């Protein structure tokens, strides 16, 4: 099964209307270190909701 | 639920004997022989017991006029009048479905004796 006419560059864009990424809406800031991070994730320097949970 | 647990155990008979598989068991049963209402016995070996509170049941194999009959009973039915253990069997399993193939000397069960 295969096309009988070339699809336009119109239809190609129309299809890709939905291909776009949602950006991460906003970042939690930690109370201790003041670092920014993903909600519910530890920080780049090992903090989560106050306490240092990693030795790094 | 505790809603269903309470509707069931206002129906459960209090007075059922302990019996376990291998036990030979006579089970009496209201039949309507007409418009009259007789008891009819049914002796044989208990091959299988389901335990589910009210839904609890048990299967009984006998050899009746040269012909094998199982009969499942629903324990807590009023059709079952009474249950009554003749002989106590000594078997390792919970289900004696291997008795279906066997007849006679093979399908003997040891008595438990204790």
């Amino acid at each position: 099964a295969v096309q009988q006419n070339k699809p336009t560059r119109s239809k190609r864009g129309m299809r890709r209307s939905h291909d776009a990424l949602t950006a991460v809406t906003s970042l939690s800031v930690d109370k201790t270190s003041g670092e920014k991070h993903l909600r519910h994730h530890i920080t780049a320097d090992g903090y989560y909701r106050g306490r240092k949970v990693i030795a790094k | 639920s505790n809603i269903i647990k309470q509707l069931e155990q206002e129906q459960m008979k209090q007075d059922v004997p302990s019996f376990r598989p291998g036990d030979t068991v006579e089970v009496k049963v209201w039949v309507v022989e007409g418009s009259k209402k007789r008891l009819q016995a049914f002796e044989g070996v208990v091959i299988a017991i389901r335990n589910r509170g009210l839904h609890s049941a048990f299967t009984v194999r006998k050899i009746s006029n040269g012909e094998g009959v199982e009969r499942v009973f629903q324990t807590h039915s009023p059709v079952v009048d009474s249950i009554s253990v003749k002989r106590r069997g000594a078997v390792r399993k919970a289900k004696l479905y291997y008795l279906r193939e066997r007849t006679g000397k093979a399908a003997r069960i040891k008595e438990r004796l204790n």
């Binding site: - | 009746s64 012909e67 059709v79 279906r100």
Partner: protein, 123 residues
């Protein structure tokens, strides 16, 4: 659940020994006979002399099944083999004058009252 091509033993004394079902009667597309149901049959084995011969086509009534019957309280009777009583094709009375093995209350009607006399045991 007797159906076309099922082989049954014969409960009566009529002459036959094995028979094969060949219709389930009483409907279009009807799949199964259970107990107390009429089926058309043919005779396969038959003992050397007796009322009926091999190849005879006639009716029977199913009186025991392995699948089992059910009773109103949830109880099941299963048997260990499928079985039937041979009948005349037209009157639909029994041919056999004795009946071997136990049978059931599901027969208990106007029609098969002759059998539940002759049975050794009704369960």
């Amino acid at each position: 659940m007797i159906q076309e091509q099922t082989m049954l033993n014969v409960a009566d004394n009529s002459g036959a020994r094995r028979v094969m079902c060949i219709k389930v009667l009483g409907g279009s597309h009807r799949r199964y006979a259970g107990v107390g149901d009429i089926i058309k049959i043919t005779i396969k084995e038959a003992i050397p002399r007796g009322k009926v011969k091999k190849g005879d086509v006639l009716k029977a009534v199913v009186v025991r099944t392995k699948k089992g019957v059910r009773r109103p309280d949830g109880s099941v009777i299963r048997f260990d083999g499928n079985a039937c009583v041979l009948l005349n094709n037209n009157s639909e009375q029994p041919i056999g004058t004795r009946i071997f093995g136990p049978v059931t209350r599901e027969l208990r009607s106007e029609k098969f009252m002759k059998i539940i006399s002759l049975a050794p045991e009704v369960l």
